[PDB]
Amino acid sequence: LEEKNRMLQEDPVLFQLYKDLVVSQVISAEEFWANRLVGISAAFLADVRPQTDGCNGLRYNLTSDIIESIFRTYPAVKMKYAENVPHNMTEKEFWTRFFQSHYFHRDKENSNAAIIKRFNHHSAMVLAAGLRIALNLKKSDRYYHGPTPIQSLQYATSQDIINSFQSIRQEMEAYTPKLTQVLSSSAASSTITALSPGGALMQGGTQQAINQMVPNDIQSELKHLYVAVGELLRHFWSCFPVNTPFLEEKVVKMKSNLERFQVTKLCPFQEKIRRQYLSTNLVSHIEEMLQTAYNKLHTWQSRRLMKKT
Amino acid sequence: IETPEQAKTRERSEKIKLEFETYLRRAMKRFNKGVH
Numbered sequence: 001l002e003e004k005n006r007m008l009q010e011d012p013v014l015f016q017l018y019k020d021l022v023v024s025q026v027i028s029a030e031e032f033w034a035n036r037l038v039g040i041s042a043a044f045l046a047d048v049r050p051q052t053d054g055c056n057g058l059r060y061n062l063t064s065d066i067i068e069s070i071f072r073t074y075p076a077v078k079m080k081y082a083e084n085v086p087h088n089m090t091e092k093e094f095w096t097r098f099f100q101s102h103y104f105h106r107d108k109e110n111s112n113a114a115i116i117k118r119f120n121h122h123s124a125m126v127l128a129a130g131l132r133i134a135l136n137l138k139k140s141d142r143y144y145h146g147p148t149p150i151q152s153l154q155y156a157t158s159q160d161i162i163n164s165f166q167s168i169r170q171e172m173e174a175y176t177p178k179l180t181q182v183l184s185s186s187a188a189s190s191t192i193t194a195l196s197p198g199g200a201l202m203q204g205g206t207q208q209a210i211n212q213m214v215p216n217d218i219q220s221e222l223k224h225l226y227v228a229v230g231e232l233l234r235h236f237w238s239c240f241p242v243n244t245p246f247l248e249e250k251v252v253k254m255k256s257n258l259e260r261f262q263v264t265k266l267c268p269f270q271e272k273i274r275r276q277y278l279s280t281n282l283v284s285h286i287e288e289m290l291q292t293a294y295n296k297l298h299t300w301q302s303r304r305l306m307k308k309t
Numbered sequence: 310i311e312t313p314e315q316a317k318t319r320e321r322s323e324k325i326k327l328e329f330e331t332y333l334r335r336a337m338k339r340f341n342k343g344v345h
Contacts, residue, residue: 050310052310052312056315058310099310
């Protein structure tokens with residue numbers, strides 16, 4: 001309850017989506033939520049210091065991360081905290097004792113032995129806490145003619161082509177450069193006319209500002225409906241390919257949800273266009289996708305029936 | 310954790326207060342002995 005509600009508050013669009021899906025009786029909350037569903041270092045004491053501010057300030061800043069690190073590395077601190085805090089002593093009092101205890105300020109053969117033993121024990125605690133095909137092608141010509149289909153490579157006739165090959169071979173054998181014959185004023189005018197704006201080569205031009213034809217609120221609603229449709233169709237195609245009877249029932253439920261979504265949200269949105277008489281066929285894409293899904297499902301039903309005939 | 314200079318000043322203050330308290334105790338004991 002509280003856990004699920006907090007997720008909705010994190011994503012208002014999801015809450016809007018959840019409102020459009022479950023509140024509108026389009027889908028159940030059960031089917032809704034069916035779709036929805038640190039290292040340890042040795043410096044945890046050396047780096048951690050009592051923070052002294054500019055003027056007499058002990059900013060201990062007792063974060064859980066350091067406390068958890070100490071408890072994992074030192075179960076003794078955990079045991080003392082459990083057996084004392086907050087009954088025998090308060091948590092801040094325990095931390096002050098730890099700061100002032102000789103176990104923290106370890107700082108003479110006995111002292112050297114104590115330091116060595118403490119270092120060895122610390123290393124042991126850290127280590128313990130760390131625990132918890134040759135290929136050969138056949139048809140190379142497939143690469144020479146890949147995804148390109150068979151072109152219309154029309155071949156010439158009999159050896160007379162050679163005569164034509166001779167003709168150019170004789171036509172350009174005695175060649176003189178020409179300048180006037182290269183272009184003419186009529187040819188230039190025709191080329192400009194082809195290149196003139198709005199001409200045969202200049203296809204199309206400026207288009208209509210569809211951004212102003214679609215209201216921004218309608219834009220946002222279209223985006224939200226697109227998100228909803230995409231989620232529903234992702235659930236629909238996720239079942240595909242169908243290999244078990246459960247997928248058939250899930251797809252039937254998804255189709256029912258899509259139909260209810262179209263009835264509840266799409267049509268008043270459609271009327272919202274029709275009342276505003278928007279000429280943009282924004283809904284046409286959504287209708288095409290929905291009809292494509294319907295056709296795919298019905299075709300698979302036909303195939304399964306034929307398999308059952 | 311106090312800075313070492315502040316710790317030394319605190320120790321001096323504690324020592325002076327303890328010495329004055331001992332002096333007051335001595336004066337009180339002398340006064341009580343005299344009264345007795």
